[PDB]
Design brief:
The structure is cut from a larger assembly and holds chains A (290 residues), B (80 residues), C (220 residues) and D (40 residues). Chain A is mostly helical and 290 residues long. In chain A, 70% of the residues lie in helices and 0% in strands. Chain A is extended. The termini of chain B are far apart. The chains are: A mainly alpha (290), B alpha/beta (80), C mainly alpha (220), D mainly alpha (40). The interface between A and C is medium-sized, with 26 and 32 residues. Chain B: GO terms for molecular function: proton-transporting ATP synthase activity, rotational mechanism.
């Protein structure tokens, strides 16, 4: 069942087993059942931990429903794959990736008064080739002012670094004059529209260049998995995969009463149903009742 | 019969924020000792206070609470 | 008056999810024509009684808006169920809140504590935890204030519910959220963030909140 | 037997979703009582 907070995440979700328990919960309220009170407590450390583990129950079936565009020509299968991950994050309660990772920077560096510290607390979220390219530009400005560059901004010593780090950003390939003017905006909406259309030209070229690098790594992982597997004899393969299947069924059958292992083995039965419904009529596929 | 201590907070204290802290720290001394006060600012603390009793330190800041929160969460998820 | 008269006779060509967004958009546009709401709810109320799970809760909450504002009544099995589906679709907008709305709602809840009198930080924050009363349909209201039996809700609407032009007035759905709580006993004081965050200091944010409460409930 | 459904045939099978749920049903009620009993 649902605990009244999982069902609020699964309203906007569209995966099947979450839409099955919402339609089972919506059928109960039509049959005279009372909706429980939403809990007006659970302070901001507990509340953002419930968001972490409830978004993960919307993301995890949604990732397994998105087909990877492996070995495709063009950008539109890669843009389909990125658009499916955007709508999955929007259903799981995330905002845009630009808004959600800039929130991650302002959360990590709430107390950092020196710009060397923001390069050392947001090291996990920025590229190590770009963290290094801003640490060299930091030391070139650290040598001139002979002082720690402070994280204030209206200091003129800051824009000794900020006008030099902007030259790195155009050297890396991203237009920082366009990105900054999008999050600040302008007065008229006509000149804010042409800086919006130049920002989303970068943004669509940013996640498609990031989804394709995620696809080109799965293509390269499956190619090195296969070429390691094509070098074995078949009798080695058949007993290595029957051992890993048996080690993973006894991992799921020793744990009983858990919801994860009962639903694991129910899916082992549902794969065997799929193989049995194809053997009845292989020209039509599995039998779907309609 | 005083107790010299220095309190480091994130923001400068209000006069109700001071009286709320004073009876909260006065159970960290096991008498009717009036800890005098001393104020210090460090916004590296994310709110709360630390009481530097010059022999012992009680860290009731939230920056230590969220750091001990994550260490408790990261130990349950490695066991569960 | 020709669009609503077109719905009085051709409300049989619409799907039950299409007939909800017709009547919701009529109740938001201030329609008094009950011959449309008699016809438009004749599509949906058999379909909910056919299969209640067919429409999503985002569309079931639009029917509780439409059956409240023009007041055209649903069956007792449907209207009790659709009112429970407004509590569900309001918390999903609150659980999945944009977190610049959460940075705004926690700012409006602070400035409505300054307006009711709190000059120190432990007495501001002790009040904002008391404003989080539960709505009678099961929902959570972030600023729910009561003086005796007179209840005032303060609702903040950041930018997502504002018109994207230069006047920047709030969209039609904030009147939907007002008039449903107003039928539950609240005097909704809507504060938009194009006006609220233009103020320079916190007590000026408190006087804009208190001007918004006195404009709605004059006893507060 | 055969011809199951469509709305439960759309389920992605070996996703986690329940090992994630097993943690959040044993982390959230175990960390609710951590911060209500928390003294430095």
């Amino acid at each position: 069942a649902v605990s009244k907070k999982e069902v609020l995440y699964f309203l906007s979700s569209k995966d099947a087993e979450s839409s099955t328990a919402v339609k089972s919960y919506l059928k109960s309220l039509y049959a005279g059942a009372q909706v429980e009170a939403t809990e007006t407590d659970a302070s901001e450390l507990i509340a953002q931990l419930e968001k972490k583990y409830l978004s993960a129950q919307v993301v995890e079936p949604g990732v397994h429903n998105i087909a990877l565009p492996l070995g495709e020509s063009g950008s539109a299968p890669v843009k389909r794959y990125a658009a499916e991950l955007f709508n999955l994050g929007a259903q799981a309660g995330f905002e845009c990736p630009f808004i959600e990772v800039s929130k991650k920077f302002g959360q990590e560096t709430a107390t950092s008064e020196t710009v060397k510290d923001v390069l050392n607390k947001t090291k996990s979220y920025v590229s190590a080739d770009y963290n290094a390219a801003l640490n060299e530009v930091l030391s070139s400005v650290e040598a001139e002012i002979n002082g720690p560059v402070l994280f204030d901004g209206k200091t003129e010593g800051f824009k000794k670094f900020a006008a030099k780090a902007k030259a790195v950003a155009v050297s890396r390939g991203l237009p920082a004059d366009t990105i900054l003017a999008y999050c600040a905006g302008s007065a008229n909406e006509d000149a804010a529209d042409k800086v919006s259309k130049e920002f989303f030209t970068w943004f669509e070229s940013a996640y498609t260049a990031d989804a394709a690098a995620e696809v080109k790594a799965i293509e390269a992982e499956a190619a090195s998995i296969l070429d390691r597997h094509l070098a074995k004899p078949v009798a080695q393969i058949r007993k290595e995969q029957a051992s890993a299947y048996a080690s993973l069924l006894k991992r799921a059958e020793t744990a009983k009463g858990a919801k994860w292992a009962e639903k694991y083995l129910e899916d082992v039965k549902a794969v065997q149903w799929f193989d049995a419904s194809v053997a009845e009529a292989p020209a039509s596929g599995p039998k779907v009742a309609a | 019969k005083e107790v010299y201590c220095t309190v480091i907070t994130a923001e400068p204290l209000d006069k109700l924020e001071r009286v709320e802290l004073t009876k909260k720290a006065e159970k960290f001394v096991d008498a009717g000792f009036k800890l005098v006060m001393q104020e210090k600012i460090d916004k590296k603390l994310l709110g709360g206070f630390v009481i530097e009793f010059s022999d012992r330190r009680v860290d009731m800041s939230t920056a230590k609470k969220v750091e001990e929160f994550n260490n408790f969460v990261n130990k349950l998820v490695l066991s569960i | 008056k020709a669009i609503v008269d077109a719905l009085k006779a051709s409300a049989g060509d619409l799907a039950p999810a299409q007939a909800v967004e017709a009547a919701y958009g009529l109740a938001l546009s201030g329609a008094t024509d009950a011959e449309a709401f008699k016809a438009l709810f004749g599509v949906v109320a058999p379909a909910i009684e056919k299969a209640p799970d067919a429409l999503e809760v985002s569309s079931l909450a639009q029917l509780h808006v439409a059956s409240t504002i023009s007041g055209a009544k649903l069956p007792a099995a449907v209207g009790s169920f659709v009112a429970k589906a407004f509590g569900l679709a309001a918390d999903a907008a609150r659980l999945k809140r944009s977190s610049a709305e959460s940075a705004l709602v926690a700012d409006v809840a602070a400035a409505t504590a300054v307006a009711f009198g709190a000059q120190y930080r432990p007495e501001v924050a002790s009040a904002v935890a008391s404003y989080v009363k539960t709505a009678p349909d099961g929902s959570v209201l972030d600023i729910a204030i009561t003086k005796g039996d007179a209840k005032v809700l303060v609702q903040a609407v950041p930018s997502s519910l504002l018109t994207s032009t230069t006047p920047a007035k709030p969209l039609g759905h904030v009147a939907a959220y007002s008039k449903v709580r107003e039928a539950q006993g609240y005097a909704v004081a809507v504060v938009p963030a194009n006006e609220f965050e233009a103020l320079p200091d916190q007590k000026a944010k408190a006087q804009y909140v208190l001007a918004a409460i006195k404009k709605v409930a004059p006893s507060f | 037997a055969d011809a199951k459904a469509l709305d439960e045939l759309r389920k992605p099978k070996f996703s986690s979703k329940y090992l994630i749920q097993h943690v959040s049903q044993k982390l959230i009620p175990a960390v609710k009582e951590w911060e209500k009993s928390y003294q430095p």
